[PDB]
Design a protein around this ligand. Structure first.
Ligand SMILES: [Mg+2]
Lengths: 623, 1316
DNA sequence: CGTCCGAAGAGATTCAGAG
DNA sequence: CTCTGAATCTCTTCCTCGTGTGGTCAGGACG
RNA sequence: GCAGAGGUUCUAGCUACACCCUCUAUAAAAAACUAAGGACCACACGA
């Protein structure tokens, strides 16, 4: 076939070489693959799993149980019994899946949470069922996405899978303290629809005894889901030394927000469920629940919030339609003004007043201005146009439009992704990156011209090729990051080093990109921080900066905090726990031993697929 | 007027733009190309002819022996397409080639020959393509995709930027030939023109001029402008021309004819040039310091001694000036150097170049080409002449010469294939001009530089390779051959040419295994335009530029249908209207625009000449006079969209569907959904599995009929007539009298292909679409093939779809499917499996196929017959036994675990010599019976047709109705008929029938021998048994279901119908999609498709309501007319009064299942039209209705969107994907999972997953699954014994892969060991 | 029945400018 | 005249897993 | 049940990952049972 024939060095180097093909990562037994299914009824500690897959993977366990119970005298007869799929075999199978975790594994395991443990729930079917919450952690779709399942065999393997790899044990991503099992796409939309208000809705005004009465009114259908009604709640706070005190008050709210109150655990305050509850609000809610209640209450609350979000999104019927995306009435006049302006610029260029470069710049600027104007008109038509009364004359409220609810909530969408539907799609660039002079004025609700779609597919092909190259580049970067690492583990607990890095909020000419509260959180200081009062030990030398310490830092108005950096650690062949800081996945100091080089490499390399490829000084505020 | 099948169900077609050009035959790119290759071309251009003529000199060395091609003719194929597919043999035509061998006398080259030997020799075995434009190679329907590669010619690239890491732009020119050696002329960063031939070491390109028999004086005369210097008494008066002063600096004080024009420090203004031209100055005095900066042009010697005073091309100094002045060189030639534009580049190379003679140049070229050995002058000359001046070892096609002359701005179009001195110097001059600034570099991605190599061109190239390979052997043999001692058949053998052609057609970088699962898949895979391939850029070597779409792709290559992944934009498909030029370039239909009128004349335009004219947009309104109603029309002049006046416009797009391909045109509302979603929808349409009962899409594009007819899936009617007899396996068409030939017309018989195994294990089922007596016109559809309904491409099956979240079962992209869908078998697809059993030769005796299998039960053997082969029609299950084969001392073929189904047929092939078993005899007997029955059926049918032909003629001029019934129908030549042309016609029919009767038994015997002869098989096999299993895979949770708009999802739960959201009418929605996928992934077309499908089903429901109750046909007619009019004017314009008033009932019954609506690609239904269509029925104009919860029973607030959108079912079923494994056979390296596939395997716990476990505190599960679960043999055995014992304890051991690595590193010669 | 014939960067390698 | 920096040349990859296919040293006759 | 053979079945069955009994040079009263091989290159496709 006229091809270079593999040598004694072609099988020790390269992707197909023995190292990276058979030693670094090797194929394994007790493994199966199938497409994945949502199955919302599951809890994140468990996953669905087909009967055939549990029968094939756990064949040695079934044989052992059959021998122990004497159903089959020999392995050979037991193997025949497994082939016959006799009913007794299924009952035996249910015994070996009671507390036997399996490692769900998606193919592009970018980061640590790519593979997680689950208690398999035997389902009839052929598709693995993956809990909806962990899909964001897996970055897994339901569009033919397949993930392998591995069966831990030894007591050590199953036990450590249960203790570490369980989705219950993976709530905070290793990259950052923010939760990773946050309500992502549909449950967040259901919660957002739940926590809103009409200025005039059915059953608005009457006082409610509690969340139970709110559920009674909503289910009976005599009160709207989101109507501004005063309710009485027993809000629990742990301001005492771990004891939870009860505060009862009549907080003005809606029925929908009162529904969620029975879901949240006792410790959480009511101020967290009294907003519109978008994606960011739910993320902050889950983070506060994790930092206050702990882990198990957070898991139970996440499961319950997923259940209610799905149920009330189904009850919402948040559809999508042509009338749901509105064309601004001022879009036509904005387009006319832009055409007049470009005609004037072209006429000026024809005379010779403006040459090609300045004409191109002027046309680009005026088209961008028209695009911004039409985007603002679209937002006004999509969130302000809604007119609804209050049993009076006239009032204006935030819109309940389907697309506005599905975009503003952060459920799925963004500013450009909503602009490309009703407003002007905008100036679309050529392959080389230089902007087409004339934009794609027509939006997706209306039709597109053939040239407009040609520019659109120019951009789309550019993006697809960019993604295809970028995923490979990010994989190479992740490999390099992992391999410069993997010799760095937390070998000690402390070093007594006063060295470190002075953590300061970063300013790049603009506002505060990252406050010091979110920049030093979870790290152990190197020297005592002091407030404006000098010789004040506000925070001692070697205390981890958890949420309470960081909150104290903000109210004391600290500026720069010296912190123990892993670079400054003098430990040999590893680093000490204090010089590293919080695990970023558990609310405590890093365990003595845990590999942080690979964690860091995966955290850095995971967003590689999400990256891209290509006077005077004025004071801002008083000070 | 409308075709009769169109009258059955006429598609409501939108689109205000009237079509001018009908859609071309989509398979033209393959059929026309091959028809050019296998055709006998008397002109000897483009075909097996050129290939024979190009390689038929056969000149013996001092032997006076010559062989020449005279004619050739492809033989009739040995086996038909169906026969070759079932046998596994290629569909090939024996290549009967006629050759003439002539021998001349010794030492008499001009004398006549002494003997002439003409005979037909079989050389080669060329496969043929079927009527569907697809080859059959080894029982597999394999298609060759056309390759889009950089055309031969000259291209001046830049490689701007990165080179030299200084911002200095380089320029290079590549002489890329069709076949031969590349020739690149590059620039050194110091502005030295180098040559780089075949990407070898860079060489001073002036050496090629010396290699072309050119000296320094000639080189400088060609590439530089001579400046004449005259020695005069007034300090060497200098001759200057006005043109050379443009753009110059103040070199000196220009004073001529006693007048000052330009002084020191004064720029030469064009006014100064004009005034000196008016003065007409020719001689201008120059200081002696200026000549120091000039360079001499030609050599000079003194007239006294002749010694070399000064050679050519070196700087001039004061001593050189004194020497030339004292010698008396009155005329001095100097080069014109202008650092602004006309800079010196050849001179610098000549300074670098140390070669001064042609022989030295040839020696250096030989050294840089073939180093390590001492070159020879004769050897170097032979190498150079065979490298550039020889046709056999170097050639540019006519397209290459055309591109060469286009880039060089020559006048002639054609020319010699090989290059010449003029070509090289012209290329160098153009490269120099590009460096200067005049002219522009070209774009590689331009479709004017990337031609298309079709299947015919590739086959011709491989045939030329085979001919030259056999020509070398013929020349070698003829050197020692003897005259009149051999037949002109021994020197040429079919073996090497046949091997080359078969290797190209079977195993190639481009011989794609056709994905024959959809008519759309077939039609878009035969039109696929791949950049990858032989003589083409590879995926890794492909740049970002090539993958990414060019502005010239408009109308030539679809910018929406490309495969995402490793090769995005490299395998782009060809647009619907584009056709390949005669030179391989891509043309595009374009309506000529007259003074102001858009004329109907269609002018195909290539990519190079598209820029010269200005192209109007298809979506430009016209006033029926060709006048744009639109004083400024958007246009595409130079690839830039820009408004133009009507009078400026030179051309207009042929239609609105031009840019998109057939795969992307079928998506309705393509102008609405995003380009990425459109890409994914077009890609997924190519992989939809045919449903059991395919049905027309309620909303479509109108090209489904065109795609179905153009593709070979359906049985189109070659001749019109009436359906005399229709059957599920055959259709008989009685040709009309005005559509049949006078002789050998008869009637048409169509044998529809029944359930047949396809390339992707799907059923190619053809069901009749007509009944008895139904009139059929020419070119009409008769059999609904796979994924076809009423002649319309029906890929999936449309159904009610409600866009609303449902308890998370459609969480992010998953699809929820009702129990009603599964119940009515909407997505049950028949899958045909090919389980083939082979009985190879074995040591210590062969193996038998009998039913005697040891250690098995009688229940398993019950299905098998007495001879050990499964009974046809038996319903076997997973793990069952099909054919009993026992090896000599239990290797019987068994059904794979999990898969089930019923056997449809069992074909057995047995080699001649070994006696066939009982089942083989029974199958052969049944095959003979079926062949005889079919032959007798066609006998009786054609005899009835011919008698009807005779009886119709015999109604006048000697008609005897009673006499005909008296004598038997066998004999009619004794009848008395008038001696006229009718009698001659009857005599001709009688003679033809007699010859047919003589040939009937001959062809029956031929068929009997075909079914009796032992089929050719692989060496060392006894007999091969193929068992075809038909699997009916129903829709299941996990099956990948996807619409046409890029919305893809796995079915999560088969929700019972009682739980489905039902409207006020009570009809439950069949599928509950997720609205959240619409805004982010802007597939807004599916919402338009959903609303239009809702309107279509509303019309269908109104028709059903007025049809279930007995209503007058007038109401149906008026409602149908109202539906087809629909307000805004459309091209459809169908009138219901012209119908027969009883086919209106048939039309209404065909519209009961829903109104068929066509939405063209870019001028489809507007929002107003859809709103009016909803208003036509009882459905609300908003498009979304209130739905009540299936379980709770109370209506959802915020009424949800429902409609009948056409969503497919992809062949990525969950049944295929299940791969669970505990223990199995292991690999070479002892990695147990054995590369998991059909072979029972475990999934690769790759390096990323190992890192993921490392990030966790995992050291026991990782260790177990990288050691005791994968390759530790002792570890694996101990772990298995422990788990079956019940103690899940790991005996670690060591991976055997590490021992393999140690042995491999040791084998290199590097001791790697372990310390104890 | 056996037996002998693009692309992107890093680093080594020339290779060169200036006293 | 001997290194300095700089151009030139050569090496070394350039994601990560699946699922369907198809093609692959090819000794050959003689003691 | 660890080195071999025999037994009622079905050529052969001694733990071969492997299923019952006997003993250290001898073959049968006895039902559930049996098999331990298998690469690379290209294409297309999915995520
Ligand atoms: Mg996905």
């Amino acid at each position: 076939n006229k091809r270079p024939l593999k040598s004694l060095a072609d099988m020790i180097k390269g992707k197909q070489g023995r190292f990276r093909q058979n030693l670094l990562g090797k194929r394994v037994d007790y493994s199966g693959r199938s497409v994945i299914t949502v199955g919302p009824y599951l809890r994140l500690h468990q996953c669905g799993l087909p009967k055939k897959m549990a029968l094939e993977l756990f064949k040695p366990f079934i044989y052992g149980k059959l021998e122990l119970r004497g159903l089959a005298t020999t392995i050979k007869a037991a193997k025949k019994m497994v082939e016959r799929e006799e009913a007794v075999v299924w009952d035996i199978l249910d015994e070996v899946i009671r507390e036997h975790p399996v490692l769900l594994n998606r193919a592009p395991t970018l980061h640590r949470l790519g593979i997680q443990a689950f208690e398999p729930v035997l389902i009839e079917g052929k598709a693995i069922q993956l809990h909806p919450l962990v899909c964001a952690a897996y970055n897994a779709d339901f569009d033919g996405d397949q993930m392998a399942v591995h069966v831990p065999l030894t007591l050590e393997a199953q036990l450590e899978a249960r203790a570490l790899m369980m989705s219950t044990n993976n709530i905070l991503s290793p990259a950052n303290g923010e939760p990773i099992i946050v309500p992502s796409q549909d449950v967040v939309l259901g919660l957002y629809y739940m926590t809103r208000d009409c200025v005039n809705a059915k059953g608005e005004g009457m006082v409610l005894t509690g969340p139970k009465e709110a559920e009674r009114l909503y289910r009976s259908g005599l009160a709207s889901l989101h109507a501004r009604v005063k309710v009485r709640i027993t809000e629990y706070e742990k301001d005492a030394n771990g004891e939870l005190v009860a505060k009862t008050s009549l907080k003005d709210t809606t029925v929908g927000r009162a529904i969620l109150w029975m879901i949240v655990p006792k410790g959480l305050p009511y101020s967290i469920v009294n907003q519109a509850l978008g994606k960011k609000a739910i993320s902050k809610m889950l983070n506060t629940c994790y930092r206050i209640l702990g882990l198990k209450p957070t898991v139970i609350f996440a499961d319950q919030i997923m259940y209610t979000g799905f149920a009330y999104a189904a009850r919402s019927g948040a559809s999508v339609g042509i009338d749901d995306m509105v064309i601004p009435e001022k879009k036509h006049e904005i387009i006319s003004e832009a055409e007049a302006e470009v005609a004037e610029i072209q006429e000026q260029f024809q005379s010779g007043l403006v040459t090609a470069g300045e004409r191109y710049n002027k046309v680009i600027d005026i088209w961008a201005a028209a695009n911004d104007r039409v985007s603002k008109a679209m937002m006004d038509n999509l969130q302000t146009e809604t007119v609804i009364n209050r049993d009076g004359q006239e009032e204006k409220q935030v819109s309940f439009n389907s697309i506005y609810m599905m975009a503003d909530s952060g459920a799925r969408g963004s500013a450009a992704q909503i602009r490309q539907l009703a407003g002007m799609r905008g100036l679309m660039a050529k392959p080389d990156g230089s902007i087409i002079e004339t934009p794609i004025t027509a939006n997706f609700r209306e039709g597109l011209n053939v040239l407009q779609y040609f520019i659109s597919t120019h951009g789309a092909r550019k993006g697809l090729a960019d993604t295809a190259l970028k995923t490979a580049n990010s994989g190479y970067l992740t490999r390099r990051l992992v391999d410069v690492a993997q010799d760095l583990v937390v070998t000690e607990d402390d070093c007594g080093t006063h060295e470190g890095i002075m953590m300061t909020p970063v300013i790049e000419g603009g506002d505060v990109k990252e406050p010091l509260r979110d920049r030093v959180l979870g790290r152990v200081t190197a020297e005592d921080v002091l407030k404006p009062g000098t010789a004040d030990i506000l925070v001692p030398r070697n205390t981890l900066l958890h949420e309470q310490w960081c909150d104290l830092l903000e109210e004391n108005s600290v500026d720069a905090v010296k912190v123990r950096s892993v670079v400054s650690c003098d430990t040999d062949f590893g680093v000490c726990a204090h010089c590293y800081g919080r695990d970023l996945a558990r609310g405590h100091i890093i365990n003595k031993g845990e590999a942080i080089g690979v964690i860091a490499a995966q955290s850095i390399g995971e967003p590689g697929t999400q990256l891209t490829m290509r006077s005077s000084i004025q004071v801002k505020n008083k000070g | 007027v409308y075709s009769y099948t169109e009258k059955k169900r006429i598609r409501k077609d939108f689109g205000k733009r009237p079509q001018v050009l009908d859609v071309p035959y989509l398979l033209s790119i393959q059929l026309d190309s091959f028809q050019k290759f296998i055709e006998q071309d008397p002109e000897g251009q483009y075909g097996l002819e050129a290939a024979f003529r190009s390689v038929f000199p056969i000149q013996s060395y001092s032997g006076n022996s010559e062989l020449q091609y005279v004619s050739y003719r492809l033989g009739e194929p040995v086996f038909d397409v169906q026969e070759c597919q079932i046998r596994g043999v290629t569909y090939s035509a024996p290549l009967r080639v006629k050759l003439r061998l002539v021998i001349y006398e010794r030492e008499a080259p001009e004398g006549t020959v002494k003997d002439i030997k003409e005979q037909e020799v079989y050389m080669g075995e060329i496969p043929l393509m079927t009527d569907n434009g697809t080859f059959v190679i080894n029982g597999t329907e394999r298609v060759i995709v056309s390759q889009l590669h950089r055309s031969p010619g000259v291209f001046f690239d830049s490689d701007k930027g990165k080179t030299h890491s200084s911002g200095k732009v380089l320029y290079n020119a590549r002489i890329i030939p069709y076949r031969g050696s590349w020739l690149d002329f590059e620039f050194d960063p110091k502005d030295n023109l180098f040559v780089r031939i075949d990407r070898r070491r860079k060489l001073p390109a002036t050496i090629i001029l010396r290699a072309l028999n050119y000296t320094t004086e000639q080189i400088l005369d060609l590439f530089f402008e001579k400046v004449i210097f005259e020695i005069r008494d007034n300090k060497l008066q200098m001759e200057l021309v006005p043109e050379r002063l443009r753009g110059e600096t103040a070199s000196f004080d220009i004073e001529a004819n006693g007048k000052v024009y330009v002084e020191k420090g004064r720029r030469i203004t064009a006014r100064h040039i004009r005034q000196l031209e008016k003065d007409d100055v020719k001689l201008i005095e120059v200081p002696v310091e200026y000549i120091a900066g000039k360079v001499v042009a030609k050599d000079y010697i003194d007239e006294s001694t002749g010694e070399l005073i000064c050679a050519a091309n070196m700087e001039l100094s004061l001593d050189l000036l004194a020497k030339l002045s004292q010698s008396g060189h009155k005329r001095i030639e100097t080069l014109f150097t202008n650092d602004l534009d006309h800079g010196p580049y050849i001179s610098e190379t000549l300074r670098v170049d140390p070669t001064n003679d042609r022989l030295s140049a040839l020696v250096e070229i030989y050294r840089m080409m073939r180093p390590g050995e001492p070159p020879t002058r004769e050897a170097a000359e032979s190498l150079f002449e065979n490298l550039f001046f020889s046709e056999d070892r170097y050639d540019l096609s006519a397209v290459g010469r055309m591109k060469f002359n286009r880039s060089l701005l020559r006048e002639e179009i054609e020319g010699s294939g090989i290059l010449s001195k003029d070509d090289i110097i012209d290329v160098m001059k153009k490269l120099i001009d590009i460096r200067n600034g005049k002219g522009e570099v070209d774009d590689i991605d331009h479709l004017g530089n990337r031609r298309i190599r079709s299947v015919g061109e590739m086959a011709e190239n491989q045939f030329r390779v085979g001919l030259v390979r056999v020509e070398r052997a013929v020349k070698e043999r003829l050197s020692l051959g003897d005259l009149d001692t051999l037949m002109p058949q021994d020197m040429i053998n079919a073996k090497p040419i046949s091997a080359a052609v078969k290797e190209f057609f079977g195993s190639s970088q481009l011989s794609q295994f056709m994905d024959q699962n959809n008519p759309l898949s077939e039609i878009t895979h035969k039109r696929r335009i791949s950049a990858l391939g032989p003589g083409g850029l590879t995926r890794e070597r492909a740049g970002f530029e090539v993958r990414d779409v060019h502005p010239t792709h408009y109308g030539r290559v679809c910018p929406i249908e490309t495969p995402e992944g490793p090769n995005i934009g490299l395998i782009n498909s060809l647009s619907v209207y584009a056709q390949t030029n005669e030179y391989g370039f891509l043309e595009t239909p374009y309506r000529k625009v007259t003074d102001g009128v858009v004329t109907d004349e269609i002018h195909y335009l290539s990519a190079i000449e598209e820029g010269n004219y200005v192209i109007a947009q298809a979506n430009s309104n016209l006033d029926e006079e060709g006048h744009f109603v639109e004083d400024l029309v958007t246009c595409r002049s130079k690839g830039e969209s820009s408004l133009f006046s009507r009078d400026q416009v030179d051309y207009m797009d042929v239609s609105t569907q031009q840019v998109v391909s057939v795969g992307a045109s079928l998506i309705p509302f393509l102008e609405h959904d995003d380009a990425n979603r459109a890409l994914m929808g077009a890609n997924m349409q190519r992989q939809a599995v045919p449903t059991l009962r395919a049905d027309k899409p309620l909303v479509g594009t109108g090209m489904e009929r065109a795609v179905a007819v153009d593709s070979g899936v359906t049985a189109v009617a070659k001749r019109g007539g009436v359906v005399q007899y229709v059957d599920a396996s055959r259709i008989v068409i009685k040709v009309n009298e005005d559509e049949m030939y006078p002789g050998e017309a008869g009637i048409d018989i169509y044998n529809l292909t029944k359930y047949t195994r396809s390339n992707q294990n799907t059923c190619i089922n053809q069901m009749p679409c007509v009944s008895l007596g139904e009139p059929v016109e020419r070119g009409d559809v008769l059999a609904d093939g796979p994924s076809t309904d009423l002649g319309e491409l029906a890929l999936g099956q449309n159904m009610r779809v409600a866009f609303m979240p449902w308890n998370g079962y459609n969480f992010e992209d998953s699809i929820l499917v009702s129990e009603r869908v599964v119940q009515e078998d909407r997505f049950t697809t028949i899958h045909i499996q090919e389980l083939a059993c082979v009985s190879r030769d074995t040591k210590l005796g062969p193996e038998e196929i009998t039913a005697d299998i040891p250690n098995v039960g009688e229940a398993a053997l019950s299905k098998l017959d007495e001879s050990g082969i499964v009974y046809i029609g038996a319903e076997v299950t997973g793990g069952d036994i099909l054919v009993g084969k026992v090896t000599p001392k239990d290797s019987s073929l068994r059904v794979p675990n999990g898969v089930s189904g019923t056997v449809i047929d069992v074909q057995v092939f047995t080699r001649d010599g070994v006696e066939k078993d009982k089942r083989a005899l029974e199958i052969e007997e049944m095959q003979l019976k079926q062949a005889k029955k079919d032959l007798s059926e066609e006998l009786q049918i054609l005899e009835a047709g011919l008698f009807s032909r005779i009886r119709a003629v015999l109604v006048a001029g000697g008609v005897e109705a009673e006499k005909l019934d008296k004598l038997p129908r066998d004999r009619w030549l004794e009848l008395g008929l008038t001696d006229e042309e009718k009698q001659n016609q009857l005599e001709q029919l009688a003679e033809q029938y007699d010859e047919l009767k003589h040939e009937f038994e001959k062809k029956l015997e031929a068929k009997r021998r075909k079914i009796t002869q032992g089929d050719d098989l692989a060496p060392g096999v006894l007999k091969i048994v193929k068992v075809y299993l038909a699997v009916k895979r129903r829709i299941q949770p996990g099956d990948k279901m996807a619409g046409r708009h890029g919305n893809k999802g796995v079915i999560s739960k088969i929700n019972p119908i009682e739980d489905m959201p039902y409207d006020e009418n009570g009809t439950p929605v069949d599928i509950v999609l997720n609205p959240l996928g619409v805004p982010s992934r802007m597939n807004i077309g599916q919402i338009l498709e959903t609303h239009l499908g809702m309107a279509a089903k509303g019309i269908g429901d109104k028709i059903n309501a007025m049809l279930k109750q007995q209503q007058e046909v007038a109401k149906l007619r008026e409602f149908i007319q109202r539906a087809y009019d629909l307000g805004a004017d459309v091209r459809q314009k169908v009138d219901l009064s012209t119908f027969s008033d009883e086919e209106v009932m048939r039309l209404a019954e065909n519209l009961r299942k829903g109104m068929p609506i066509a939405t063209p690609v870019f001028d489809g239904a507007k929002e107003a039209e859809i709103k009016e269509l909803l208003k036509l029925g009882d459905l609300p104009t908003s498009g979304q209705i209130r739905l009540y919860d299936g379980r709770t029973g109370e209506q959802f607030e915020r009424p949800v969107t429902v409609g009948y959108m056409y969503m497919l079912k992809l062949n990525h079923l969950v049944d295929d994907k299940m791969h669970a494994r505990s223990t199995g056979s292991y690999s070479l390296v002892t990695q147990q999972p054995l590369g998991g596939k059909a072979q029972f395997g475990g999934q690769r716990f790759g390096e990323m997953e190992v890192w993921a476990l490392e990030a966790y505190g995992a050291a026991y599960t990782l260790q177990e699954m990288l050691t005791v679960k994968s390759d530790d043999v002792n570890g694996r055995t101990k772990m298995y014994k422990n788990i079956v014992d019940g103690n899940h304890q790991m005996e670690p051991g060591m991976p055997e892969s590490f021992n393999v690595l140690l042995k491999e590193i040791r084998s290199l010669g590097i001791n790697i060991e372990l310390e104890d």
